[PDB]
């Protein structure tokens, strides 16, 4: 792609969510979501293979329906109240349809079936944007209407996302699907608390982004897309295993790493409202979320796998790819728990 086109497309991607935040009309909100939709497909379909075409078609066709459902909710609110904002004294059916469509946009279970597929069908970048930046405006909708959501399906969807992400990532040898099921689980943790202090939803979002972006960079540095490809990392670039390990163990939330803070404080604010057994189930399936990360980091950092003869050429040559932000984002994850009161 020529530079004019990249400028246009990345401006559109940046402006979709930005319009979605700085807009009181729900319709310009919808407009921003549709810019995010339209501008993503060119770069999803850039390499021009059947996998990319399938990924782009699935993304488009799943997001268009959710967009139409959100527009229905908005038009029904306009009919009811003559305004372009979800007030109180709106209909719970309108609000729940909005929630359903937003969950289909995010990728939450039982609307999760498309995210791992699409993510496998596209490069490591366009998985990063898809899993980090596209999640921010759809979450902004819910954050702006958090005292209007029903506290029941909001939690059933979270619990389904937790369970299904854990169980799906249990058996995925492909890494681009592990990241997807991780997204599903973390959006579950977010959406569970979103009616309860939505600052914590943004906390978990920022933590999740700061963990996933450098992980995607790690996969990018050798174009690793499989357990067997990431296992050939004690030979190619072995200075990264420390950060990969601590980042995986932050993703699967273990205490001394800051990836335990969101789950811990979420459980806190959920036990402050007598949402006890749900939090218990969530905390007990986060362990299964941790299990496959542990398997992975065995495979790459603790039990060095066989390598090849041709991997010595990689040792002859030199590299330039670590963007100097991998370091900052990996170290600000995994080592920022004692600064947690300044995060909350």
């Amino acid at each position: 792609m020529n530079p004019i086109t990249l400028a246009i497309i990345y401006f559109t991607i940046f402006l979709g969510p930005v319009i979605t935040m700085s807009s009181t009309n729900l319709m310009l909100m919808w407009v921003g979501l549709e810019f995010s939709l339209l501008a993503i497909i060119p770069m999803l379909i850039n390499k021009k293979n059947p996998r990319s075409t399938e990924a782009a078609t699935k993304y488009f066709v799943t997001q268009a329906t959710a967009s139409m459902i959100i527009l229905l909710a908005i038009v029904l609110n306009y009919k009811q109240l003559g305004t372009w904002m979800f007030q109180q004294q709106t209909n719970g059916l309108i609000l729940n349809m909005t929630l359903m469509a937003l969950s289909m946009k995010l990728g939450l279970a039982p609307f999760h079936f498309w995210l791992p597929e699409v993510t496998q069908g596209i490069p490591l970048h366009m998985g990063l944007i898809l899993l980090t930046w596209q999640k921010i405006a759809p979450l902004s909708i819910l954050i702006q209407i958090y005292p209007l959501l029903n506290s029941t399906i909001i939690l059933m969807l979270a619990i389904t996302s937790i369970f299904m992400g854990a169980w799906g990532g249990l058996n995925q040898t492909q890494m681009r699907k592990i990241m997807a099921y991780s997204s599903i689980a973390h959006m579950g943790w977010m959406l569970a608390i979103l009616p309860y202090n939505p600052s914590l939803t943004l906390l978990n979002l920022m933590i999740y982004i700061i963990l996933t972006a450098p992980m995607f960079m790690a996969l990018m540095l050798n174009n690793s897309m499989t357990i067997n490809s990431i296992s050939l990392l004690w030979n190619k670039t072995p200075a990264m295993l420390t950060m990969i390990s601590l980042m995986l163990l932050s993703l699967g939330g273990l205490p001394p790493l800051t990836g335990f803070l969101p789950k811990w404080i979420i459980i806190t604010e959920l036990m402050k409202n007598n949402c006890l057994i749900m939090a218990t189930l969530m905390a007990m399936m986060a362990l299964l979320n941790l299990f496959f990360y542990t398997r992975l980091i065995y495979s790459t950092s603790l039990t060095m796998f066989p390598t090849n003869n041709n991997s010595k050429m990689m040792t002859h040559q030199t590299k330039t790819k670590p963007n100097l932000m991998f370091s900052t984002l990996a170290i600000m994850s995994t080592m920022t728990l004692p600064l947690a009161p300044q995060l909350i």
Binding site: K319, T320, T328, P338, L339, Q342
Partner: protein, 120 residues
């Protein structure tokens, strides 16, 4: 929840009321912890790019330390302001609604009969 607080300025990192709070020390354990995080960031950057460690990028390491401290100072100031505001509003609400937070008056261990539970 404090977004709808009256007089709340939109996208104001440090309102003028926060200038009445005392600042940090600049020797705070958390700012030197952030400097340590910057030093480890530079070290990790050098380790990843197959460079020497504690020897190579002293300008980069200094910049990392200073950026981390120079951001943490203001972020910690904002957080101090926000927690101050929390205590402020909490005190105001209890002072406006004493019927809900009554002047409780507790008893002694001579008047209350807590039950005995032997071990045996």
């Amino acid at each position: 929840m404090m977004n709808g607080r009256p007089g709340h300025e939109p996208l104001k990192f440090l309102p003028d009321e926060a200038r009445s709070l005392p600042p940090p020390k600049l020797n705070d354990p958390r700012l030197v912890y952030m400097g340590l995080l910057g030093y480890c960031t530079g070290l990790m950057d050098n380790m990843l790019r197959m460079r020497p460690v504690m020897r190579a990028g002293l300008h980069r390491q200094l910049l990392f330390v200073t950026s981390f401290v120079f951001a943490g100072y203001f972020y910690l100031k904002r957080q101090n302001y926000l927690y101050a505001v929390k205590d402020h509003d909490m005190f105001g609400y209890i002072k406006l609604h004493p019927e809900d937070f009554p002047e409780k008056e507790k008893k002694t261990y001579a008047e209350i009969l807590e039950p005995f539970h032997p071990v045996r």
